[PDB]
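Forum: Protein Structure Q&A
Topic: Joint prediction for protein chains with partners

I've read a bunch of threads here and the consensus seems to be that you should model interacting components together rather than docking separate models afterwards. I'd like to see that in practice. Below is the full input, 1095 residues plus whatever partners are listed. Could one of the regulars post the assembled result?
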Amino acid sequence: EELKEGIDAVYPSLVGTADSKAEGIKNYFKLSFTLPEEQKSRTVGSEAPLKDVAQALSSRARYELFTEKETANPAFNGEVIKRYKELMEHGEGIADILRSRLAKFLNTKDVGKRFAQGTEANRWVGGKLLNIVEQDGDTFKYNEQLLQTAVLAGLQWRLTATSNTAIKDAKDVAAITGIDQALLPEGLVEQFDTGMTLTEAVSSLAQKIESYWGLSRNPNAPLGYTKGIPTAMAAEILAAFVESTDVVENIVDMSEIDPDNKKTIGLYTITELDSFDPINSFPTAIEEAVLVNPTEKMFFGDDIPPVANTQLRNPAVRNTPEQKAALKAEQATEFYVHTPMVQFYETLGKDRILELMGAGTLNKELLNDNHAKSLEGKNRSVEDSYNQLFSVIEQVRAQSEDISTVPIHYAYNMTRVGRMQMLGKYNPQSAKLVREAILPTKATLDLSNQNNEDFSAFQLGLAQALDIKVHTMTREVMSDELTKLLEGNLKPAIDMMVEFNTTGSLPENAVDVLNTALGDRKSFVALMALMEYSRYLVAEDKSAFVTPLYVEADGVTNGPINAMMLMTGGLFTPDWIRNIAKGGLFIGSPNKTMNEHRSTADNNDLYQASTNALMESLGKLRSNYASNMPIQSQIDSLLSLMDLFLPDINLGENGALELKRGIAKNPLTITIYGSGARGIAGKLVSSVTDAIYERMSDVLKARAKDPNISAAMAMFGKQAASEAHAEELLARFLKDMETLTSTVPVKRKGVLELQSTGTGAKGKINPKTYTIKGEQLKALQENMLHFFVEPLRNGITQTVGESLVYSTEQLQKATQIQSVVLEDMFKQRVQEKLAEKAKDPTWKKGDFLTQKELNDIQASLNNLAPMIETGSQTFYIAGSENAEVANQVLATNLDDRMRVPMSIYAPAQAGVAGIPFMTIGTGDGMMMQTLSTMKGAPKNTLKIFDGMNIGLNDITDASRKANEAVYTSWQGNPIKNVYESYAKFMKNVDFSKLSPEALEAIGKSALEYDQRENATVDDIANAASLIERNLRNIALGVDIRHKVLDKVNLSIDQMAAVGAPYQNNGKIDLSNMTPEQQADELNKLFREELEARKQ
DNA sequence: TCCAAAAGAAGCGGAGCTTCT
Ligand SMILES: Nc1nc2c(ncn2[C@@H]2O[C@H](COP(=O)(O)O[C@H]3[C@@H](O)[C@H](n4cnc5c(=O)[nH]c(N)nc54)O[C@@H]3COP(=O)(O)OP(=O)(O)OP(=O)(O)O)[C@@H](O)[C@H]2O)c(=O)[nH]1
Ligand SMILES: O=P([O-])(O)O
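Posted by a regular:
Agreed with the consensus. Here's the joint model:
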């Protein structure tokens, strides 16, 4: 252990003594880090990192010599070198700001003088950077090596951080803001998704800094310093970037939104470089110069990504061997640029792509304020995708003379729910714009005869891309629907694209031509279809047409169907047989396809089935209050308002209700996964208000074109036949808004009662500022909840089955109870350790625990089985990083601001997370994993979780393999996996040890409401063990069901489009039987199997 | 209670209580 000597030799002049027991100032940098056995950073040992790296960046020859490589990325040319020269000079400016900020900190309140006199200011939350200073006469100065290396990290972060951030949705913004998700003001989500929170910015910066410093953390040093020092440095660099205007800080006052929200929340936005900045073409020169093993880079040719050892953001969970094999397979796939699409995008240009695929130029006064904010977010996503694609294209273009010949590989990792995620925001898996420009799919096709199988494959790809629902009709019928479209409405766009694929020119009205031809079929993949068909038309050799056009083998109501197959536990029922067939499990129908099912047997998918059940439940609710005119009227008004604005709700002239599957799509999915009804009500209301705000811009558009337009024709002219007819749609609108905001349903003793809000809407509508908000939004939500969402939930349960609902409830309860215990025991062992440390004279409050101490606490929980194992996947439901364990500031900047909480990897309560973790994981996650690793695994695909893009040459075999992979996943038993973990947990848990908080948390899950109050430890223990029994019985039923199903003749077409179903070749023939007959025979086999078990 | 990543700021003082034009 000559590690102390080693690091002291590199940093001999840092203030203090590297001995935790020494009496004076102790140096916590040298106490916290060691030199690595093998070099990680080329700046370790450098007297002047900025000068050294700037010299390295100054020429190709110098770069190659610094990095010890033969050749540099060809994108690193003269123009890029000139930009890095200028960036390096800016690095000097950042360094200078930092030095001045230190000087100010040392001067203020005599901190420097006191520090020199022995005040341990280096251990304060704002003084941890004093661990990297050196005595300088009557003052102190930064160690230049550590300062300059940190600045290099700062520069790289500045270049590429924005592109690397997570996407914020409504739930994220709700957690951040503390505002109820259903009540988030319009445009707030966009505001927060465009910026980084303090924790987001500092943590990403701190990671980079620690990486570039290139040392290893001492396992026996307190986290207050190992995490604290790089975090303190990050905070200072963020502050310096704010001074330099590289970063804008915006402190958002929540009280202007919710007046009793006291939170003021910092948002940090990096100043964007010009889209045409040469540095965009190679933004990682610093990273690839400093680090021996760079993270940030593109992988060209045979440069392939390494395989990740651990689950994304879950370092306690190693990727299994099967998972690692899947990752290797996906990373091995070669992606290539499709030049025609790149040229098309380029020729249209950014402005016209925004006009076509976004919202175009916004006239902020033909626009409702709320609608305007939604349109800004639409533009932002498309624009960022476009810019990112072209930066990537510029880098590819440097690699060779023919950009279409340059292989590209992408890094992937497994997420906590077992999905293979392509790393990055703007890649083929995540970004539709990019997905049509960079593809692994490729085929050489004989399209000389429109009767070829090759031409049929080509047609299928075109049709699917053009929004023909290819899984709902046979290949033959598809062909005719496509032909009708190509020769009809799409013809003008095809002609335009033929001209483009001849001369390279587009007409001035290109956007209008595409818009009018496509209508609601418009998408990036639709643009690919127009491109590829027109290319075929002009092709000189149609017998060898080369195209990346693909067919997606795409899951049919995938999550719900997987849940039903994986977690239904009872005897077989005929309703279940009928409903599961809607997802492509066919019993007694050899070689049956989804296409045939939809066309000849049942045109109603699982969404339509639940929508139909909603119509029944709604009808019953209307009957239970038949005599109640106020209630009937309130329901009518809700339905009227929805009919006005949503395509999926239609009221006929005689009051006949038609609901389309579209309204049940998200509600169905999220309900199984443990979503409450209130959140669904919120989302349905948001869909309505979105449409209202959109219609208000339609009004402003009408008025400007025609000053003497009536308010009725302005708002309902596109929807009506006469002027007075538009007047009745307007009368409906104002009547509906008044009654739905001034009156709400409340459930009192099971019966719905109407209550006045006192906060009804009325007054002249100002279409520009019109906003539904606060108490008015709450009211619309309460109406939606009781008169629509509740019936829908009843319909959903009827459709997926009460048995599945029971399984998911037991799953939720078991995993929640386990997570509560894990969280509480981890916290107690931490608190017990802190009580010991307080007796240690070397320890100070704010120093936390060491990594060794934390690992020992993590290891101590292992007899509680925190991990779920399936044999090929590992799930850690409780795994989190949170600020609650340490409950303290980690570091601040030198102005006593940017106070970053100390976050710790620790178990936290699951809530309902167990349901989606296991359903997604053992369903689509296992499917894809299997597809990547099975015998004859399809090559050259793009997997997107529950769909896989396949090149036209291999659509048949790849689809059949996909259906086989579904079948393989259907041999899983997630409840059994949960049971095995929970049973071990039950063997080792002591409920008497839990805090009354944890004990209450468990009570809610394990006990009926009337029993929470004050039940005993032994009560909740006995209730928790009953859940173990429930799990065991469910797991047993599932096992039997899968075994029995596998004995029978099955045709599986869940990954549908192509009509290539997987046959299980089970030997019991259930053909020419009704579902009732089939249920009887399956239940006979079940009881047979149950008897073999008992005997 | 849907999931795939968390996540107030800042004066005084040197942690953690306090207050929030
Ligand atoms: N908890 C949960 N799960 C959700 C969900 N929406 C969907 N899921 C899960 O995915 C399957 C299949 O859904 P699908 O729409 O066919 O395919 C999606 C999906 O796999 C994934 N995805 C989008 N949003 C979410 C999400 O909010 N959560 C999760 N876990 N997954 C999501 O991405 C696929 C779409 O990829 P693509 O870029 O091609 O986009 P599309 O062309 O489909 O159009 P777009 O609007 O962008 O999606 C479900 O059965 C379920 O298990 C949800 O809200 N919550
Ligand atoms: O066109 P699809 O949605 O049936 O694959």
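Residues 1-306+878-911 of chain A form one domain.
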